[PDB]
C-alpha cells in the first residue's frame, strides 16, 4: 500500500478545523442562541454536542485513519452489504459542489465590488433601486433596504426571473467569479495533500484574524453590548420546548459535517497510530469555539444597528446568506473606514467556504482514487475534469434566476440524503461490524479502548439522535417557497429525486451485491458481513 501521509500533523489539523468551521458557524449558530433563549441555548446545544455530534465526528475520523482508504472502499472494506454507503455519500458530496460553491463566488463579487470610496449598497438612488427602497431593514415585505435591493437587483438580478422555469440571461460577471473559485480550488487540490494541507494554512487561519479585527471593531461600537444582551440573555423557558432541542440537535450535527466522506478521506492519510481521539476532541471544540466567538462579531454590530441606525432587532437578526450579504454589509457601510471592514469580512466568508469545500471534493477524489487506480494515477487530470463538469452546469447559478436554482438544491440535494446515510453509517459500525470490533480497532491505534460512554453513544443514542433530527425536519416540512414565489410541484418532485438518487445507492448496491455472490441466504450474509480485514 504505502499511502500518502500529511507533511505535518498541523496540516491535518488545519485542513480539518478548516473543513469543519464554515458559514453555518457565523450565520446560523448566533441566531439560534438569539431565537432560542440566548445563553440558555448552550445547555441543549452542549448536551446534543456531547452525546450526538462529537460521537459521530469521532467515529468517522477513526474509520478514516484505521481503514486507510477512501469512502467507497472503506465501507466495502468494512461491511460489503452496505458498500453503497460510500457511493451515496460520494454522490452527496458530488451534488453539493454543484451549487454551494456559489456562496464563495458571491463573496468574491462583494470583495471585487468593495474597491471603491463609497460602497454601492448604502444608497437608495441607483439605477437598480425601486421607490420602495429604504435606507435600512424593515418589517413590511414590499419595502426592502438599500442592501437588500442591491443584492437582489444588481448582483443577483433575481427580479428578472419569474421562477425556477425562468432562469433568464446569464450574468457573465458572476460566471467569471465562479471560475475564479474553481481556480482557487484546483491549484490547491490537483497535487493532493502535498499542497492541500499547505494552502489550508491560509484559508483555515485567516478567519481568526478577520474575527479578531472584527471583534474589537464590533465591541467598540456605540451600542455593542445591547446585541450581546440579545445574543446571550438567558431565557431558560426555551429548554422545555422540544423544537429548540431539535434546533440544537440539527445544528450540532451539520456544523461538524460528518457522513460526507471528508473526515474519512482526510483521516485515511494519518499515521495508523495517531491519537485520533485527541484530534477529534480538539478540532470539534475549536468548531463550536469559533461559533461562540462569531456570535459576538455578529451581535455586537447587530446591536449597533438597533442603537444608532434605529432598526428593530427582529428585522436584522436573521440567518443564512441574508445575514452576510445584506444586513452586515449595511452596517459596515455606516461605520468609519468602511471599505476596510468590508474586504476583511468578505474574504472571511470566502476563506470560510473554501476550506470546507476542499474536504468535500477531496472526499470524492480519495474515494475514487482508492477504487479506480487509473484515476488515482491521474489525479491532476481527473480533478481537472471534475471542476470542468462543475463549471458547465454551474452556469445555472450565474443566470438571473440562479438563486431560485441555489435555494432549491440547498433544501433538497444534501439535507435528508446525509441523514439516512449516517443513520446507516451508524448502525453498520455499531451492529453489523460491532462496537467490540470497532473499540478493539482503535485500541490497536491509540493504545486504549474507547470508554463505555463513547460506544454507548455509538450504539443507542446515535440512531435516536438522527431520528430526532429527521422527525423535526419532516414535522416542519412545507412545499418549497422563496419570498413571494411558490415553487411548482414538479420542482419539489425534482428535489426528492436528487435526494433519493444518492441514498438509493444503499439498497440498490445492497441488492446488486446480495444476488451477485453464491451460496444460501445465511451463507451469503456471512459473506457480506465479514470484513475485509478479518478475512485478511
Amino acid at each position, epitope marked *: 500500500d504505502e499511502r500518502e501521509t500529511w507533511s505535518g500533523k498541523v496540516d491535518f489539523l488545519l485542513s480539518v478545523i478548516g473543513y469543519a468551521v464554515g458559514l453555518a458557524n457565523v450565520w446560523r449558530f448566533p441566531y439560534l442562541c438569539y431565537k432560542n433563549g440566548g445563553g440558555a441555548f448552550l445547555v441543549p446545544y452542549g448536551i446534543m454536542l456531547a452525546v450526538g455530534g462529537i460521537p459521530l465526528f469521532y467515529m468517522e475520523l477513526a474509520l478514516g485513519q484505521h481503514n486507510r482508504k477512501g469512502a467507497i472502499t472503506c465501507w466495502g472494506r468494512l461491511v460489503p452489504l452496505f458498500k453503497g454507503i460510500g457511493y451515496a455519500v460520494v454522490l452527496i458530496s458530488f451534488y453539493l459542489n454543484f451549487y454551494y460553491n456559489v456562496i464563495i463566488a458571491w463573496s468574491l463579487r462583494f470583495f471585487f465590488a468593495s474597491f471603491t470610496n463609497s460602497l454601492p449598497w448604502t444608497s437608495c438612488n441607483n439605477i437598480w433601486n425601486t421607490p420602495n427602497c429604504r435606507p435600512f431593514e424593515g418589517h413590511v415585505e414590499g419595502f426592502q433596504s438599500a442592501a437588500s435591493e442591491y443584492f437582489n437587483r444588481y448582483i443577483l438580478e433575481l427580479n428578472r426571473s419569474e421562477g425556477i422555469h425562468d432562469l433568464g440571461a446569464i450574468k457573465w460577471d458572476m460566471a467569471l467569479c465562479l471560475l475564479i473559485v474553481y481556480l482557487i480550488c484546483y491549484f490547491s487540490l490537483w497535487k493532493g495533500i502535498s499542497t492541500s494541507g499547505k494552502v489550508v494554512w491560509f484559508t483555515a487561519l485567516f478567519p481568526y484574524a478577520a474575527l479578531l479585527i472584527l471583534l474589537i471593531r464590533g465591541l467598540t461600537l456605540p451600542g455593542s453590548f445591547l446585541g450581546i444582551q440579545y445574543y446571550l440573555t438567558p431565557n431558560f423557558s426555551a429548554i422545555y420546548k422540544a423544537e429548540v432541542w431539535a434546533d440544537a440537535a440539527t445544528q450540532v450535527f451539520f456544523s461538524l459535517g460528518p457522513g460526507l466522506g471528508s473526515l474519512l478521506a482526510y483521516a485515511s492519510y494519518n499515521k495508523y497510530h495517531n491519537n485520533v481521539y485527541k484530534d477529534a476532541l480538539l478540532t470539534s471544540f475549536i468548531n463550536s469555539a469559533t461559533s461562540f466567538i462569531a456570535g459576538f462579531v455578529i451581535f455586537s454590530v447587530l446591536g449597533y444597528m438597533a442603537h444608532t441606525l434605529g432598526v428593530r432587532i427582529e428585522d436584522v437578526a436573521t440567518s443564512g446568506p441574508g445575514l452576510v450579504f445584506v444586513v452586515y454589509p449595511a452596517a459596515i457601510a455606516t461605520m468609519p473606514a468602511s471599505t476596510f471592514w468590508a474586504l476583511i469580512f468578505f474574504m472571511m466568508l470566502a476563506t470560510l467556504g473554501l476550506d470546507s469545500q476542499f474536504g468535500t471534493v477531496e472526499a470524492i477524489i480519495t474515494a475514487l482514487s482508492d477504487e479506480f487506480p487509473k484515476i488515482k494515477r491521474n489525479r491532476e487530470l481527473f480533478v481537472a475534469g471534475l471542476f470542468s463538469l462543475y463549471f458547465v452546469v454551474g452556469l445555472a447559478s450565474c443566470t438571473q434566476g440562479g438563486f431560485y436554482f441555489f435555494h432549491l438544491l440547498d433544501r433538497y440535494a444534501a439535507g435528508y440524503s446525509i441523514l439516512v446515510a449516517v443513520f446507516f453509517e451508524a448502525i453498520a459500525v455499531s451492529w453489523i461490524y460491532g462496537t*467490540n*470490533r470497532f*473499540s*478493539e480497532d482503535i*485500541r*490497536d491505534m491509540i*493504545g*486504549f*479502548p474507547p470508554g463505555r460512554y463513547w460506544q454507548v453513544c455509538w450504539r443507542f443514542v446515535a440512531p435516536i439522535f438522527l431520528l430526532f433530527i429527521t422527525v423535526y425536519l419532516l414535522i416542519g416540512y412545507e412545499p418549497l417557497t422563496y419570498a413571494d414565489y411558490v415553487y411548482p410541484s414538479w420542482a419539489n418532485a425534482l428535489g426528492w429525486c436528487i435526494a433519493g438518487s444518492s441514498v438509493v445507492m444503499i439498497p440498490a448496491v445492497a441488492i446488486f451485491k446480495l444476488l451477485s455472490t453464491p451460496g444460501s441466504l445465511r451463507q451469503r450474509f456471512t459473506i457480506l458481513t465479514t470484513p475485509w*480485514r*478479518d478475512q485478511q
Partner: antibody
Amino acid sequence: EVQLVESGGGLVKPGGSLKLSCAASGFTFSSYAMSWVRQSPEKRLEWVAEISSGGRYIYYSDTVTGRFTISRDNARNILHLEMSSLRSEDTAMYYCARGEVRQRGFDYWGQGTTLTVSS
Amino acid sequence: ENVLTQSPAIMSTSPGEKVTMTCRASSSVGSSYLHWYQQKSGASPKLWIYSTSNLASGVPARFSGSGSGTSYSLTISSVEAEDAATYYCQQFSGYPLTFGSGTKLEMKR
C-alpha cells in the same frame, strides 16, 4: 476478583512442542487484551506475545515468531500459547498478564507456569 | 528492540533512608507508556507505577516516579523492609514490548 492461573508446563526435549493455557476468572475476559511474558532462571523478564481482546491483532517477539502461536477462547475464558520447535533458550517461567490499555500497563499477572527444555 | 537498562543492579539501603533507581531507554519513549513493576522474591510481578508517575491501586504514596524521554527513575521516599524486592521498568510504547534489566533492593544491616 480478577484471577489468572497458568496451566501446562514441564520439561520438553529440544525441538519438542507444548501448549500452555491461562484460565481467566473474575472479569470480562473478552474485552481485555492478554499477553505472555516470561522470565528465565537468570531473572530476565521478556515479553513474548500479545493478543488483542478480539484476537484480531497479534504481536510476537522476534525470538519466538514462527515457533509460538497465541490464541483466545472467550467462551471458556482461556488464553493459550502453542509452542513448537523449542530451543533451550525458551526455558523460563511463563506469565499470563492482563494488559488492555497500553498507557496503564499490565494490570494483573498470573502465578506463572514453568517450562524446561533439555536433552 | 528498545533496550532499557536499569541502575543500580542491586542496592542495599537502611530502612527510613531514601532510594532512587534509574531506567535508561536506548530510544525515547513517551511519558504515558513507561511503567514500573515490583516483583518480590518467589512471586509474580505486580503493576507498581504506570505512566511515569501514577501509582497503582494499593502501592503506598511513599513511592513516586518521574523522568521522560530516554531517562526515567523510581524513588521511594522512606524505605521499608516490605520494599525489599526487584523493580522492573517496562515500555509499552512500541513493539516489541521490553522490560528493564531490574534493580534489586535489599536492606542494609
